[PDB]
Amino acid sequence: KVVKFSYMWTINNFSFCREEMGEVIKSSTFSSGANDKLKWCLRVNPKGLDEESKDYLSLYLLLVSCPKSEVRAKFKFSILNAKGEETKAMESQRAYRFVQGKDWGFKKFIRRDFLLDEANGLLPDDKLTLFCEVSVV
């Protein structure tokens, strides 16, 4: 069976976080619970790290622990708006393969200008809230 879980990550003062937190930002470590060998984190590059992704926020799921062996997981990321609604969701279509220190995700998860345009309601009080759902086989 599948073990489905989630993590909600709030990055405060998002508009300054490249200065205050750096080029790459790792979340706190999380898992499904206390009955779980697996430890994961999210990694964000508030500006993508090559010519092509420079206008995008990049978002990855990183396996931090040293598990039994290879882990195969599906993942879904989305952005929670001002109203508490999930938007801009994208999915791994299949299960990717993680070993300790391996990440998978989207180098171009979302355009910064989309995110920064206040009409879109994605940075209420300059807080970016990301929702990650993970599904381990």
Binding site: Y60, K88, M90, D103, G105, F106, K107, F109, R111, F114
Partner: peptide, 10 residues
């Protein structure tokens, strides 16, 4: 593209 669904590793 407002989002790009290509999955890569870091």
């Amino acid at each position: 593209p407002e989002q790009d669904c290509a999955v890569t590793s870091g």
